[PDB]
From a paper:
Diadenosine-5′,5-P1,P4-tetraphosphate (Ap4A) is a ubiquitous second messenger from bacteria to higher eukaryotes, which responds to environmental stresses and cell cycle phases. Ap4A then binds to the histidine triad nucleotide-binding protein 1 (HINT1), thereby disrupting the protein–protein interaction with microphthalmia-associated transcription factor (MITF), and the released MITF eventually promotes the transcription of mast cell activation genes. The HINT1 protein is a compact and symmetric dimer, with two adenosine pockets at opposite sides. Here we report that Ap4A specifically polymerizes HINT1 into (HINT1-Ap4A)n (HAn) filaments in solution and in the activated RBL cells.
To understand how Ap4A regulates HINT1, we set out to determine the crystal structure of human HINT1 in complex with Ap4A. HINT1 was reported to efficiently hydrolyze aminoacyl-adenylate (aa-AMP) and ADP, but neither ATP nor ApnA (such as Ap3A, Ap4A, and Ap5A). Incubation of 1 mM Ap4A with 25 μM HINT1 at 37 °C for 24 h showed minimal (<5%) hydrolysis. Therefore, we started with wild-type (WT) HINT1 to co-crystallize with Ap4A and solved the HINT1WT-Ap4A structure at a resolution of 1.52 Å. Consistent with previous reports, two HINT1 molecules formed a dimer through the five-stranded β-sheet and the central helix in the crystal structure. Despite having co-crystallized with different ligands, the three structures were nearly identical, with root mean square deviations (RMSDs) < 0.083 Å. However, in all the three structures, only the electron density corresponding to an AMP molecule was observed in the adenosine pocket, indicating that the ligands had been hydrolyzed by the HINT1WT protein during the crystallization, which took 3–7 days at 18 °C with a high protein concentration of ~2 mM.
Numbering used by the authors:
A (entry chain A): 13 to 126
B (entry chain B): 12 to 126
The structure:
Amino acid sequence: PGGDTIFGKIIRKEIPAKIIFEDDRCLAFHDISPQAPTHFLVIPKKHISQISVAEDDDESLLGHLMIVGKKCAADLGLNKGYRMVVNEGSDGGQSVYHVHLHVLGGRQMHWPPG
Amino acid sequence: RPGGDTIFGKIIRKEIPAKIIFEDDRCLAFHDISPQAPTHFLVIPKKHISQISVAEDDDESLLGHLMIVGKKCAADLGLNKGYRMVVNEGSDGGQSVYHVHLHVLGGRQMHWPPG
Ligand SMILES: Nc1ncnc2c1ncn2[C@@H]1O[C@H](COP(=O)(O)O)[C@@H](O)[C@H]1O
C-alpha cells in the first residue's frame, strides 16, 4: 500500500516530510529539493506509477490533486500565481515512479518550462 | 457564449483555425502556435474556466479528464520516451491566455527546473 518508492514511505509515515495537507486519498508536502521559494508536491495515496498508465477511472482523483494543489497554493500565500507540473518518463525528467504534481511559486517562472 | 471570450473560445467554436488532435464533449486538444518542444500541444475544457485558481470543487472530473486526454494524445503522437505537463497560473506562472489549459511537451529532453 502506497507503493515501493520513497513517496510510499512518506505516505506510510515511515520517513519525515513537511506535510501541508492530507485527506483519505492524497497527500501534499514540501519538496526536499525546492526549485522555487515555494515548491511542494501533491500525490495520490493510490500507487499510480506514472501518468501514462492512469486509467479513466482515475479521472476524479487526478483532478482532486489539482484542486488540492490550488487550495494549498492559496493557503501558502501564492497570490501572484504559480506553475503546476507533471513529469512523465525519461524525457519528462520524472524522478520518482509514483505520480506527483509539482506546484512552484514565490518567483517568476520562465519559458520554456525546462 | 459556449467556450468564452478568449481566443481559445473562438478555437472551440471553429471561428479561428487550429490543428486539432482530439475533441469530445468536454475538451479539445490542439497544437501550440509557438512550440517549446518538438511536440507541444494544449488540452483545454470546452467550459470556460479563467484559471486554475478559480476552479470549483465539482470541476475535479473535468480537470482530471484534461490529464487523461493529455496522456492519451501523447501516446497517440508517439511520445514513448516521455513528456511534461504544465499549467501556468497568473503572473508568476506566466499565464497569457485566461482560459484554463494543460501544456503537453515532448520529443526532447526536458530540463530541471521547469522554468
Ligand atoms: N491561436 C493559438 N493557437 C494555438 N496556441 C496558441 C494560440 N494563441 C496562443 N497560444 C498558446 O497558448 C499558450 C498561452 O500561454 P500560457 O497562458 O502561459 O499557457 C502559449 O503557449 C501560446 O503559444
